[PDB]
Write a protein that binds this ligand. Structure first.
Ligand SMILES: *C(=O)[C@@H](NC(=O)[C@H](N)c1ccccc1)[C@@H]1N[C@@H](C(=O)O)C(C)(C)S1
Length: 261
């Protein structure tokens, strides 16, 4: 209900908590460290998917075109792409895999279609996000050092990107609704913002974790009653809490946001 509540939550969070709760239709905004840089981790996959869909909308790409999968493409935590070595996958299926289960090789196979991390960054800049910097592919995009902006975003920037790509018309209506359905089908966020959020809200989200001290969760919140959605951007970096502990913080971020709805 206030900015103070998130700053208080940070104290028990173990590290650096960044939260942006934003209601574009009213201009309401709440959070904490909303303009500081945080490692994106796997949340970079959300702008990656939007960049792909934008190129599809422009006719420079097809969701039905197929990308070849080679053994050298496979890296850790790639549950769908590892089954297609020696054949190909549609771009649409690559997008879905990287989004809803965080297929890492899927991300690496999509990136060259939008000219890699520099191409992702240029897309974000053209669309209005001048903070987010996408520099490396997987797994090294999960590296973070303070003062090193590579593969970082800010809670405000990523809430902005949720608004641009899901709510504005950066994307065609078919693309923006497919992107939404992918977030709604996310498989990795059940213990995170969703677990704290109140009944009556449809959640689409995308998560990330470095497995040691960082967990991120970005979400769109549509009222099932219909009406104007909220965006919720959460980055927890350098926490003493492990993944389950950081899940508990993300859950509590959902509980605070839920009271202000
Ligand atoms: C993106 O952040 C991905 N994270 C990793 O690949 C890490 N190396 C990793 C951390 C913990 C367990 C396994 C791998 C994917 N997003 C994470 C998440 O959303 O929690 C993931 C575990 C689903 S993998």
């Amino acid at each position: 209900v206030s900015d103070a509540d998130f700053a208080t939550l940070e104290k028990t969070s173990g590290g650096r908590l960044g939260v942006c709760l934003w209601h574009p239709a009213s201009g309401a905004r709440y959070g904490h460290r909303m303009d500081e840089r945080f490692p994106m981790c796997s949340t970079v996959k959300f702008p990656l998917a939007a960049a792909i869909l934008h190129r599809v909308d422009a006719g420079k790409l097809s969701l039905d075109q197929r990308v070849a999968v080679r053994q050298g493409d496979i890296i850790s935590h790639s549950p769908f792409t590892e089954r297609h070595v020696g054949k190909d996958m549609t771009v649409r299926d690559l997008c879905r895999a990287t989004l809803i289960i965080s297929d890492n090789a899927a991300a690496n196979l999509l990136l060259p279609l939008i000219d890699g991390p520099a191409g992702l960054t240029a897309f974000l800049q053209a669309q209005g996000d001048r903070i987010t910097v996408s520099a490396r592919n997987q797994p090294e995009l999960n590296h973070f050092a303070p003062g090193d902006p590579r593969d970082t975003t800010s809670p405000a920037a990523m809430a902005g990107n949720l608004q641009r790509f899901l709510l504005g018309d950066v994307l065609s209506p078919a693309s923006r609704q497919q992107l939404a359905d992918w977030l709604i089908d996310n498989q990795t966020g059940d213990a995170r913002l969703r677990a704290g959020l109140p009944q009556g809200w449809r959640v689409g989200d995308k998560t990330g974790s470095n497995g040691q001290d960082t967990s991120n969760d970005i979400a769109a919140l549509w009222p099932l009653a219909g009406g104007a959605p909220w965006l919720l951007s959460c980055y927890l970096q350098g926490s003493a809490l492990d993944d389950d502990g950081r899940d508990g913080i993300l859950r509590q971020v959902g509980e605070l946001a839920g009271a202000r709805l």
